[PDB]
Design an enzyme around this catalytic site. Structure first.
Site, mmCIF file in Angstrom:
data_model
loop_
_atom_site.group_PDB
_atom_site.id
_atom_site.type_symbol
_atom_site.label_atom_id
_atom_site.label_comp_id
_atom_site.label_asym_id
_atom_site.label_seq_id
_atom_site.Cartn_x
_atom_site.Cartn_y
_atom_site.Cartn_z
ATOM 1 N N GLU A 182 72.883 40.800 -60.586
ATOM 2 C CA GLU A 182 71.916 41.290 -61.550
ATOM 3 C C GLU A 182 70.736 40.310 -61.684
ATOM 4 O OE1 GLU A 182 71.590 44.139 -62.604
ATOM 5 O OE2 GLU A 182 73.611 45.075 -62.605
ATOM 6 N N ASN A 217 62.417 49.105 -64.772
ATOM 7 C CA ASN A 217 63.077 50.274 -64.224
ATOM 8 C C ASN A 217 62.033 51.421 -64.033
ATOM 9 O OD1 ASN A 217 65.663 49.034 -64.439
ATOM 10 N ND2 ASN A 217 65.546 49.435 -66.659
ATOM 11 N N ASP A 232 62.236 54.410 -65.057
ATOM 12 C CA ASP A 232 62.101 55.217 -66.245
ATOM 13 C C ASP A 232 61.225 54.575 -67.284
ATOM 14 O OD1 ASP A 232 63.762 53.318 -67.423
ATOM 15 O OD2 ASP A 232 65.439 54.685 -67.827
ATOM 16 N N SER A 253 61.818 51.703 -68.865
ATOM 17 C CA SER A 253 62.579 50.674 -69.549
ATOM 18 C C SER A 253 62.544 49.394 -68.693
ATOM 19 C CB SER A 253 63.991 51.135 -69.757
ATOM 20 O OG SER A 253 64.715 51.273 -68.575
ATOM 21 N N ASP A 303 65.018 45.744 -67.787
ATOM 22 C CA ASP A 303 66.277 45.026 -67.868
ATOM 23 C C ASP A 303 66.005 43.522 -68.094
ATOM 24 O OD1 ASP A 303 67.655 47.389 -67.271
ATOM 25 O OD2 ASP A 303 68.201 46.756 -65.253
ATOM 26 N N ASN A 310 69.338 46.684 -70.782
ATOM 27 C CA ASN A 310 68.212 47.627 -70.783
ATOM 28 C C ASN A 310 67.644 47.919 -72.173
ATOM 29 O OD1 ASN A 310 67.495 50.747 -70.239
ATOM 30 N ND2 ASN A 310 67.727 49.948 -68.138
#
Ligand code: CL
Ligand code: CL
Ligand code: CL
Ligand code: CL
Ligand code: CL
Ligand code: NA
Length: 129
Positions: A35, A46, A48, A50, A52, A59
Site C-alpha cells: 500500500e 483514486n 473516483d 477520493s 488514500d 480512503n
C-alpha cells in the site's frame, strides 16, 4: 516517516493488530508494504476522486475527512491528514474498523492481489517481536 519492516511489525503488534480479526501480523506488514512502501506520508488519488492516506492507504470517502471527497462519511471520525503522522495509532484504530466491516482484509486491494494466500510470515522474518 519511512518505517523499517521490523520497526513497523513491532508497532503494529504493540497496537494490537497481530491476529486482529484473525489476520496475523505478517498480513498487516505485507499490506503496508504494498500500500505505502512503509511510508506514513504516502497519498494517492483514486479514480473516483477520493484519496488514500498513510501507511495503510485509507480512503477519504468512507473512512476519513479530507474536505474534497463528495459523500464523505468520516466513519473513523478523523482528518485524513492524521493518517500521515509518524505515530501510527490513528491508522491502526481506523484499520481495525475497516477490517471489521464485513470483507476482512479484502478491503485493501493490494492485500487481496499481492498478499492473500502467500507466505506472509516472511514479512516478520528476523524480527525480535
Ligand atoms: Cl521490505
Ligand atoms: Cl504472519
Ligand atoms: Cl469531503
Ligand atoms: Cl506508533
Ligand atoms: Cl475474515
Ligand atoms: Na470522507
Amino acid at each position: 516517516k519511512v518505517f523499517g519492516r521490523c520497526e513497523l511489525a513491532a508497532a503494529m503488534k504493540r497496537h494490537g493488530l497481530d491476529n486482529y480479526r484473525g489476520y496475523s501480523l505478517g498480513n498487516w506488514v505485507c499490506a503496508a508494504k504494498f500500500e505505502s512502501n512503509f511510508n506514513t506520508q504516502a497519498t494517492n488519488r483514486n479514480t473516483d476522486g477520493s484519496t488514500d492516506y498513510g501507511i495503510l492507504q485509507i480512503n477519504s470517502r468512507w473512512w476519513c475527512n479530507d474536505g474534497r471527497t463528495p459523500g464523505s462519511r468520516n466513519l473513523c471520525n478523523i482528518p485524513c491528514s492524521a493518517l500521515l503522522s509518524s505515530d501510527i495509532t490513528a491508522s491502526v484504530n481506523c484499520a481495525k474498523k475497516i477490517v471489521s466491516d464485513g470483507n476482512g482484509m479484502n478491503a485493501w486491494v493490494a492485500w487481496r492481489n499481492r498478499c492473500k494466500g502467500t507466505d506472509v510470515q516472511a514479512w516478520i522474518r528476523g524480527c525480535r517481536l
